[PDB]
Amino acid sequence: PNASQVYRSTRSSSPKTISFEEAIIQGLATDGGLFIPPTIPQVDQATLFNDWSKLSFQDLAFAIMRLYIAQEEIPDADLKDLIKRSYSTFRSDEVTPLVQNVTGDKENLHILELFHGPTYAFKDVALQFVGNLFEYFLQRTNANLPEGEKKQITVVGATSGDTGSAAIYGLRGKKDVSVFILYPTGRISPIQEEQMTTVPDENVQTLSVTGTFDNCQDIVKAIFGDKEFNHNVGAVNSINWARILAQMTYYFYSFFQATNGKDSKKVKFVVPSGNFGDILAGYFAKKMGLPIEKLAIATNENDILDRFLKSGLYERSDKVAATLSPAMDILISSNFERLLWYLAREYLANGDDLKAGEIVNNWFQELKTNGKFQVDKSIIEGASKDFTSERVSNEETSETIKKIYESSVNPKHYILDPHTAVGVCATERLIAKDNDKSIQYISLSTAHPAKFADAVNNALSGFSNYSFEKDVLPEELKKLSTLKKKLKFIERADVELVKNAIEEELAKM
Ligand SMILES: *Cc1c(COP(=O)(O)O)cnc(C)c1O
Incomplete structure (x- = not known):
């Protein structure tokens, strides 16, 4: 190595x-x-x-x-x-097809569709790969065990909506693995639950915990913190390295799609972000050699990142503002730390990997104490060489869905999910002030419109031609409400119970 x-x-x-x-x-x-x-x-x-x-x-x-x-x-x-x-x-x-010049040729607005995977959300790119990875590594290990005493993992986690779907489809049917995902009942929209409870595979079993979502974090964090609960317990994370690694592929892929042949090799990526993993993968491609413009971080009202990149003050909010783009509604962008390490290493540790760890560790310590830490101007100045950011409100989110629907040309009446919208909104603000329409803008579409009907419907209700069922809902997604669900309720946030249900894997998991 x-x-x-x-x-x-x-x-x-x-x-x-x-x-x-x-x-x-x-x-x-x-x-x-x-x-x-x-x-x-x-x-x-x-x-x-x-x-x-x-x-x-x-x-x-x-x-x-x-x-x-x-x-x-x-x-x-x-x-x-x-x-x-x-x-x-x-x-x-193409796995991740680039839809170019959606709004005609007055500008270069490309939408990179990352929702063509099993769950119609971009997290499939990472999770499909990671799940297979896990199976592969677990296999080689057990490849020596004696068909007995062969290790087995059991992923466990809670879902506020879609996040879990990706994990379930990436782990479904993988040898010696099992996935248990808790979710607050009635708190999960129909389509998200259908994706989860529909899958036939045995190694999967969702738990419909009767309570809240913030309730499920604890009713699962407990099982997580462990007890006599040592048998190999997996984790539902967003910070795995394999995730970042898998996500690097489409930046390169689309970059070439947007420049092969063409004379303009200048391209700018706009990425609606939450935990920074997606855009951070774009950061890596940039540092590997991809000659692209500054990466654009697009966020919704939960702008911890936009504020940081503007002040050097990484402060966690108290309230998680509700938005039309729920999957980005976060208090702290988990992978952001990774960027901070490289920043600290170049501008505060003169290349010393070890002093970088010291520096980053102290910063995340101040966080778990003052819920906020200040960085030296050299850090935000260093970040601004590779990153730009935009905050997109709900009003603007909805209006962007409407604007593109009318404005689109290739194809006509192109529908955006709200998360992509947040991104296209930022993308358009950039086209306006960049003063260089030769630039190729690639805006990331992280979710198929069908995953968030409400936002799409409420924004396109004002059109007589619009019909969710005719223009959005995919046939394959229409069958869901008609497939047999494998529910399993757990009344009361009983950590003791969550445990018991997990235990019932009927030996044959
Ligand atoms: C998870 C998610 C995001 C956030 O991506 P990060 O890697 O966490 O920045 C954006 N959009 C959708 C549709 C998601 O499911």
Whole structure:
């Protein structure tokens, strides 16, 4: 392994580094930090435009991943299989198709559709890959056990809506793995529950906890904190390294789609963000050599990131404002820490990986004490060389859905889900003030409109031609309400009960 195929915790001050496999399985680091490659792999322009520009999503995934995963940890054959199977469940031949010049040619507004996977939400790109990864690593281990005493993992977590769907489809049917996901009853919209409870696979079982969602965090954090509950318990996270790694593929893919042939090789990505993982993957591609403009962070009212990038003050809010784009409604952007490590390393530790861990660890300590920390101007100045940000209100979110519906040209009446809207809204603000329409704008569409009907309906009610059922709801998604659900209620937030239900895996899990 080279400096890019080795990993360390953003909070560690030790010279020690672990393997890819270990970073992946461990998930979060013992000290609470996140894993990251101390050295970002460098790809030269020649290779980018002579060899990578001609590759398919899957082949790029291989080229990119070979840079962070050593041959020893995962051979070419095995890795190419993981990729092939991971993306074979995508309804688009391209996996992540770029829809170019949606609004005509007065500007260059491209929408990168990342919702063609099993659950119609962009988290499939990561989770399909990670799930297969887990199965692969767990398998090799057990490949020595004696059909008995063979380890088995059990992922457990709570869902406020969609998040869980992605995990369920990425772990469904994977050998020696089981997924138990708690969710507040009646608090989960129909379509999100249908995706979860519909899947036939046995290794999956959702729990309809009667209570609140913030109730489920504790009714599961307890099971998590453990007790005599040691048998290998998995975790439902957003900070796994494999996640970031999988998400890098489509930035490269779409970049080439937007520039191959064309004379303008200038492209700017606008990414509706929550926990920063998605856009952070774009950061990595940028540092690897992708010659792109500043990455645009688009957020909804929960603007912890927009505020930070503007003041250097990373302060957690008290209230989680409700918005039309729920999946970005967060108090603290978890992966942001990863960026802070690289920032701290370049502008405060003069390259010292270890002083960077010290610095980051103290910052997240101040957070867990004053709920806010200040960074030196050199940090925000360093971040502003690669990032721009925009805050999008609900009014603007809805109005953008309406504007694009009327405004779209290729195709006509293009419907946006609210999360993508937040992004297109920011994308349009940028087109306005960038003063360079030659720039290729690629706005990330993180969810298919059908996943958030309400926002789409309430914004397109004002059109006689609009019909959710005729223009949005996908046939494959229409069958859901008609498939057999596998519910399992748990009345009262009884941690003791959540435990018991989990235990009933009927031996044959
Ligand atoms: C999870 C999610 C987001 C947030 O992505 P991050 O990686 O957490 O920044 C945005 N949109 C949708 C539709 C999501 O499900």
